[PDB]
């Protein structure tokens, strides 16, 4: 029972939950929720959302 | 109960009766709910609702009354029966 990490929001999600999206070239993505999946594919940028970790990292980048 | 002359504050939940009625009848039903609620909780035989309270109930149309009212109540005695008067807080 190990905890996977989300490719959009960077938080950990519990065993028996979420999704693995597989590209044909082999790159694997993990999603905690439909929210994150849908935002990632319609193109919202997580570096501007204060409920993600990429925001903290980009603030460090300011 | 509550004793006359006193100024009391009540929060009325209109969320409750929302979704009992169709959207276009929500404000007129909220009025009756307010009257019934304050009668029950002030133990009054009559309720007189201020025009300012009615206007706040109807501020955004007939479809969107507020979810929680804050109101001031004063009870008076005359001839026996209790009469409650409602204003805005």
């Amino acid at each position: 029972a190990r905890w996977n990490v989300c490719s959009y929001c960077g938080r950990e999600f519990e065993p028996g939950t979420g999704k693995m999206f597989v590209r044909n070239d082999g790159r694997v993505l993990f999603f905690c929720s439909s929210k994150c999946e849908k935002y990632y594919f319609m193109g919202r940028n997580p570096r501007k959302l204060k409920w993600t970790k990429a925001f903290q990292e980009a603030r460090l980048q300011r | 109960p509550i004793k006359p002359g006193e100024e009391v504050i009540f929060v009325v939940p209109i969320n409750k009766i929302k979704k009992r009625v169709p959207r276009w009848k929500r404000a007129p039903r909220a009025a009756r709910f307010v009257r019934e609620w304050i009668a029950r909780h002030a133990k009054a035989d009559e309720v007189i609702i201020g025009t300012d309270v009615n206007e706040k109930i109807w501020e955004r149309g007939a479809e969107k009354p507020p979810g929680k009212l804050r109101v001031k109540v004063v009870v008076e005695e005359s001839e026996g029966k209790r009469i409650a008067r409602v204003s805005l807080a």
Partner: protein, 344 residues
């Protein structure tokens, strides 16, 4: 002709509201061990675990996802003993003895209780029954029991039930009962972890429903959907017999039925809302509380799978009456993860 099977089953007819909301048990299993053959509690919620598979099949030895329902089981009070003899057609009640010291709240259910009935009269009646049992006149002995829902702040009105006892010797059963009367019973003293159980409850209510939902009939062609007969059936039958048959599907009550569900595994028995892993104790109540329920505080069963009923409802449990040959072993399985995250 095109052939196909009929729409729904005829084995649960008439499809009516249950007689009572407390479920009765019609048949009992054969168990050599002299014990009380079941228990009762209140449904609380669902969650899931991850565990190493113990059942036969492939996936044995593998980690797997398993869903779980939690039943809160405070202790029962044994208030009486009842004796059964053989009648002309079947069993007939001979005599009951009630205990003398009962909780106040039992009168909310049994409105007319005895008044004086001292300890001494109690012992005299038990002696009467012991002599009756020693004579040879008696075919069966059963316990009379009631719930205590005031220890969990759910209710004050109790549920009153009658349970059976395992084994063959009527005298041995009676000795068990004489030990148990006037004392509390806890689920650990009766059930074994890893056992298969049958579960009995009244199903969720849905009211009046039509035949698409009640019997699984087809929706009609879109022409009929525009003609006003989309969610109807076509016809009530042939010209002769010149009557509607009872077998033809129609609308009515759906849900609030009596149902029994076979072979659900008990996975763990807990204590005071906590479960013991290898080293640590963990609260099974999830963050924020079980929805449409609150916080589990007394004692609980984990039963894998799904069970009938709404959340705050009385559930009865017995040992399996119709189990398979290839059983899982009667030990607690090795659990690796329990979900405690919010369920809302």
């Amino acid at each position: 002709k095109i052939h196909r099977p009929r729409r729904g089953s005829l084995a649960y007819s008439p499809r009516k509201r249950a007689k009572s909301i407390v479920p009765r048990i019609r048949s009992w299993p054969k168990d050599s061990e002299v014990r009380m053959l079941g228990f009762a509690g209140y449904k609380a919620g669902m969650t899931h675990i991850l565990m190493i598979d113990d059942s036969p099949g492939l996936t044995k030895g593998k980690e797997i996802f398993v869903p779980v329902t939690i039943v809160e089981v405070p202790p029962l009070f044994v208030y009486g003993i009842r004796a059964y003899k053989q009648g002309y057609l079947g069993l007939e009640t001979a005599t009951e003895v009630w205990f003398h010291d009962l909780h106040k709240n039992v009168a909310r259910r049994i409105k007319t209780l005895p008044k004086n009935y001292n300890e001494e009269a109690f012992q005299a009646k038990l002696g009467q029954l012991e002599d009756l049992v020693n004579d040879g006149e008696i075919a069966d002995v059963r316990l009379l029991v009631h719930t205590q829902p005031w220890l969990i702040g759910l209710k004050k009105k109790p549920e009153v039930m009658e349970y059976a006892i395992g084994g063959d010797d009527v005298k041995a059963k009676f000795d068990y009962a004489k030990e148990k009367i006037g004392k509390e019973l806890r689920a650990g003293e009766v059930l074994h972890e890893g056992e298969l159980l049958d579960v009995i409850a009244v199903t969720k209510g849905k009211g009046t429903q039509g035949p698409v939902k009640r019997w699984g009939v087809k929706v009609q062609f879109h022409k009929a959907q525009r003609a006003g007969k989309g969610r109807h059936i076509g016809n009530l039958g042939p010209w002769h017999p010149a009557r509607v048959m009872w077998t033809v599907p129609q609308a009515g009550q759906m849900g609030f039925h009596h149902r029994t569900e076979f072979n659900k595994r008990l996975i763990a028995i807990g204590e005071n809302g906590k479960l013991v892993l290898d080293g640590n104790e963990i609260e099974i109540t999830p963050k924020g509380g079980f929805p449409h329920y609150g916080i589990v505080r007394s004692d609980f069963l984990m039963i894998e799978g799904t069970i009938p009923g709404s959340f705050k409802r009385i559930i009865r449990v017995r040992p399996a009456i119709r189990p398979p040959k290839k059983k899982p072993p009667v030990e607690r399985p090795q659990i690796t993860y329990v979900s405690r995250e919010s369920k809302q």
